[PDB]
Structure formats: structure tokens, C-alpha cells
Design an enzyme around this catalytic site. Structure first.
Site, short mmCIF file in Angstrom:
data_model
loop_
_atom_site.label_atom_id
_atom_site.label_comp_id
_atom_site.label_asym_id
_atom_site.label_seq_id
_atom_site.Cartn_x
_atom_site.Cartn_y
_atom_site.Cartn_z
N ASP A 42 0.79 -1.23 0.00
CA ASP A 42 0.00 0.00 0.00
C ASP A 42 0.83 1.29 0.00
O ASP A 42 1.34 1.71 1.01
CB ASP A 42 -0.99 -0.04 1.18
CG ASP A 42 -1.93 1.15 1.22
OD1 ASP A 42 -2.12 1.81 0.16
OD2 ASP A 42 -2.51 1.44 2.32
N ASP A 45 -1.53 5.65 -5.37
CA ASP A 45 -2.04 4.80 -4.26
C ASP A 45 -2.33 3.37 -4.72
O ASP A 45 -3.45 3.04 -5.22
CB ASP A 45 -3.23 5.49 -3.59
CG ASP A 45 -3.83 4.73 -2.44
OD1 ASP A 45 -3.30 3.67 -2.08
OD2 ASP A 45 -4.89 5.22 -1.88
C1 916 Z 1 -9.59 1.80 -0.52
C2 916 Z 1 -8.62 2.06 0.63
O1 916 Z 1 -9.05 2.59 1.65
N1 916 Z 1 -7.34 1.66 0.53
C3 916 Z 1 -6.40 1.88 1.68
C4 916 Z 1 -5.72 0.53 1.84
C5 916 Z 1 -6.68 -0.61 2.15
C6 916 Z 1 -6.45 -1.86 1.55
C7 916 Z 1 -7.33 -2.93 1.84
C8 916 Z 1 -8.43 -2.76 2.68
C9 916 Z 1 -8.67 -1.50 3.25
C10 916 Z 1 -7.79 -0.42 3.00
C11 916 Z 1 -5.40 2.99 1.26
O2 916 Z 1 -4.39 3.20 2.26
C12 916 Z 1 -6.14 4.31 1.10
N2 916 Z 1 -5.18 5.33 0.75
C13 916 Z 1 -5.47 6.75 1.10
C14 916 Z 1 -6.68 7.17 0.25
C15 916 Z 1 -7.33 8.50 0.75
C16 916 Z 1 -8.51 8.79 -0.20
C17 916 Z 1 -6.27 9.63 0.82
O3 916 Z 1 -7.88 8.28 2.06
C18 916 Z 1 -7.08 7.60 2.93
S1 916 Z 1 -7.32 7.48 4.58
C19 916 Z 1 -5.85 6.51 4.82
C20 916 Z 1 -5.53 6.10 6.24
C21 916 Z 1 -4.60 7.09 6.95
C22 916 Z 1 -3.33 7.29 6.15
C23 916 Z 1 -5.25 8.48 7.13
C24 916 Z 1 -4.21 6.57 8.33
C25 916 Z 1 -5.16 6.23 3.59
C26 916 Z 1 -5.90 6.87 2.51
#
Ligand code: 916
Length: 377
Positions: free
Chosen positions: A33, A220
């Protein structure tokens, strides 16, 4: 190298690399990720987990006595922080001690049959939870080994099962063709980039380019879709509708909530336009474009039950949190996360998935006279 072809996945469910944690080593598959910065692994039973991290069996486990909570776009997890030894059997030949979140509860995070049991956040400490003093895995790897501060991703997702490569510490020339084009990392938190122009069938969407980066744009690998801020998403949907108007689809399709289906082998690729995203270049007012085919933004949904057809979800969706260049758009490019030079490189990958008419491309330079900064804030 022994690093080629070390990723696997199911379409829409992320790509994963095999890792070990603990000593003696415990094998786990871990989601790759670039959109987050926490290393977390299932650490208690769950209906969707084949296996999980047993801290009691690891003599190198050290508990940090601190809980952590991570909410993503839909799913979230909570767990306990500690450190342990970590290896990547099909990555560099090294062992590192790294922070690890032992997930003890979660909601909508694990995916039924995805085959991964954890997530590797490859982004920067600024966005780690609980806070930025929780050193991310890649930073530990670089500090502890001689490994160059860069990694590349070749996501293939070929034809349910997908594959790819994550190459750490280098660029594997065998994995791309033509040139590598670089876009600057605007700020080291997410892998933040700037889109300066968007075209559909070569037609410019004609918006102030800040709108494309409202309120950040990121690269991403943990998000499937190309996600676009509302104003941009509606403009894109209108053009793609216009370009494909020989066929009419339900609104549900455009919302990403319904499949469209055609008799097997007969998907009309040619009615759907290409999409060009122009990315800020390394020199003032220069850009390059990555061009994506409907074979990447119409994502196949494998389902033996619907298999007299080929069926697809529209893999472009609205975002209220900025533009996300997800798996859709990384697939069939070789993408170089050059942290050492604060840039990200794109080239056409050895697994590009093209027509006999059209091909995905990375091409430049393009110059724009308009003296406007496309960064949102
Ligand atoms: C669709 C998604 O949420 N992908 C996550 C990874 C994930 C993989 C499998 C199951 C659930 C989640 C990815 O990290 C999302 N990446 C960014 C996307 C954005 C629109 C900026 O929103 C968010 S919140 C986040 C978590 C924090 C970094 C804020 C802790 C990461 C992200």
C-alpha cells in the site's frame, strides 16, 4: 532477479507480497500500500483470515504498550504496537526490525478470499498512526540495511488472479520499455503529485488545473479506482458518455454500483475513449502524459455465475478527499517511487494491456504557456 513476479492478487482486492515476521519466521501475505504508512498484520482469528501473527511464538517480539487505530476510506482496524524481525523472502536478502501493529479487531478491512493477512504502508511517516514518530517499514529498512532509498512497482493484473513485481532498491530495466518520465513528489506524506491537464479522447476537460488536485492528488496502490474530485469526475463522466454514446448504460453503471455485461469476447473496447492524465514534469511548465485505455478503467468482475458474459465495473469514481491514482492507473505502467530524489517515475510496463488499435503510453514533453501553479494549497 529473484524479485520479479513476487506479487500476486485478485482483481479489485489489492496486490500482496510474501513476508515473514517473528523468529522463528511466520509467513504472511501482505498488501502493498503506497497510500498509507502503517505495517499491520492480522494477529487474532477472523473469518476471512487463513492465518495470523502469533506474538507468543516469537522470541524477538517486543511489545510497545501502545494501542493504534487506523481508519481508511471504508475499512478500519485497531491493534497493539510492538516491534519484531521482518523479512521479504522474494525481496532483498536482509532482515529488519520494524514497527508492527498487531490487529486485534477490524471492521470491513479483511476481504473474504483475498489471500492477504496484513498491509504494508509504504508512504511517509507524516501520515503514520498514532503519529509520525512511528517509523514506517521502508524507512527502517533503509536505515538498517544498505538498500537504496527507492522501490518500484509493476502491477500487472493480467487475466481473477493477477500478479506483478515489487523491486526494492533499484530499477529493473527488464520490466519496462521506452523512457522513464518523472513527476516531483510534492510533499512527503502520501506520495503527493500534481496533475496539470486531463483529456478524454484528446479533448481537454478545460478546468482550472487546481481542480484536478483538489485538495491533494496521490499515487495509491491500495486503492483500486481512479478517484476524481466531484467537479472533475462529473466532467469526465460527461465526456466518456459522449464518446461512447452508441450504447447507453444505466446511471448505476456510471456510479460504480452496477456491472455492465456483454456476451463473452464481444466487449466493444472501441466505443470507449482513452483518458490522458498529464503530470507536472521536473522542469517549469513541462509535463508528460500517461494514457489509459478502457481495458484499465473497465475492471472485469470474475464470477462463474455470470460467465456466459464478460462483465465490468466502471473503475472511475468520485472522491471527496482528492484525486487518487489507484491500481487501475498503475496497471501496465512500471512506477518508480524514487524517494531519494523526491520523484515518481512512470514508464510503459512489459505487461501493458493494449488493442491492435491503441496502446497505453507515457509520453512527453508537453509545454504550457499558462503561468499557473496547479497545486491546490
Ligand atoms: C480503498 C482504501 O481505503 N485503501 C487503503 C488501503 C486498504 C487496503 C485494503 C483494505 C482497506 C484499505 C489505502 O491506504 C487508502 N489510501 C489513502 C486514500 C485516501 C482517499 C487519501 O484516504 C485515505 S485514509 C488513509 C488512512 C490514513 C493514512 C489516514 C491513516 C489512507 C488513505
Amino acid at each position: 532477479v529473484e524479485m520479479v513476479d513476487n506479487l500476486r492478487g485478485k482483481s479489485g482486492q489489492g496486490y500482496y507480497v510474501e513476508m515473514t515476521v517473528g523468529s522463528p519466521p511466520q509467513t504472511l501475505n501482505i498488501l502493498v500500500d503506497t497510500g498509507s504508512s502503517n505495517f499491520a498484520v492480522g494477529a487474532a482469528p477472523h473469518p476471512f483470515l487463513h492465518r495470523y501473527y502469533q506474538r507468543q511464538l516469537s522470541s524477538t517480539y517486543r511489545d510497545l504498550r501502545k494501542g493504534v487505530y487506523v481508519p481508511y476510506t471504508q475499512g478500519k482496524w485497531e491493534g497493539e504496537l510492538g516491534t519484531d524481525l521482518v523479512s521479504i523472502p522474494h525481496g532483498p536478502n536482509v532482515t529488519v526490525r520494524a514497527n508492527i501493529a498487531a490487529i486485534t479487531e477490524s471492521d470491513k478491512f479483511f476481504i473474504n478470499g483475498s489471500n492477504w493477512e496484513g498491509i504494508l504502508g509504504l508512504a511517509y511517516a507524516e501520515i503514520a498512526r498514532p503519529d509520525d514518530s512511528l517509523e514506517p517499514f521502508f524507512d527502517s529498512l533503509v536505515k538498517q540495511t544498505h538498500v537504496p532509498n527507492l522501490f518500484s512497482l509493476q502491477l500487472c493484473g493480467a487475466g481473477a488472479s493477477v500478479g506483478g513485481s515489487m523491486i526494492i532498491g533499484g530499477i529493473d530495466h527488464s520490466l519496462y520499455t521506452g523512457s522513464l518520465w518523472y513527476t516531483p513528489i510534492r510533499r512527503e506524506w502520501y506520495y503527493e503529485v500534481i496533475i496539470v491537464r486531463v483529456e478524454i479522447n484528446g479533448q481537454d476537460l478545460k478546468m482550472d488545473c487546481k481542480e484536478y488536485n483538489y485538495d491533494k492528488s496521490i499515487v495509491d496502490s491500495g486503492t483500486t479506482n481512479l478517484r476524481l474530485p466531484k467537479k472533475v469526475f462529473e466532467a469526465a463522466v460527461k465526456s466518456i458518455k459522449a464518446a461512447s454514446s452508441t450504447e447507453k448504460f444505466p446511471d448505476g453503471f456510471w456510479l460504480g454500483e452496477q456491472l455492465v455485461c456483454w456476451q463473452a469476447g464481444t466487449t466493444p473496447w472501441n466505443i470507449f475513449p482513452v483518458i490522458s492524465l498529464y503530470l507536472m514534469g521536473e522542469v517549469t511548465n513541462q509535463s508528460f502524459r500517461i494514457t489509459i485505455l478502457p481495458q484499465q478503467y473497465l475492471r472485469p468482475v470474475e464470477d462463474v455465475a455470470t460467465s456466459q458474459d464478460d462483465c465490468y465495473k466502471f473503475a472511475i469514481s468520485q472522491s471527496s478527499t482528492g484525486t487518487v491514482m489507484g491500481a487501475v492507473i498503475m496497471e501496465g505502467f512500471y512506477v518508480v517511487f524514487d524517494r531519494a530524489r523526491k520523484r515518481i517515475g512512470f514508464a510503459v510496463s512489459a505487461c501493458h494491456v493494449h488493442d491492435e488499435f491503441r496502446t497505453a503510453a507515457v509520453e512527453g514533453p508537453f509545454v504550457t504557456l499558462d503561468m499557473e501553479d496547479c497545486g491546490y494549497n
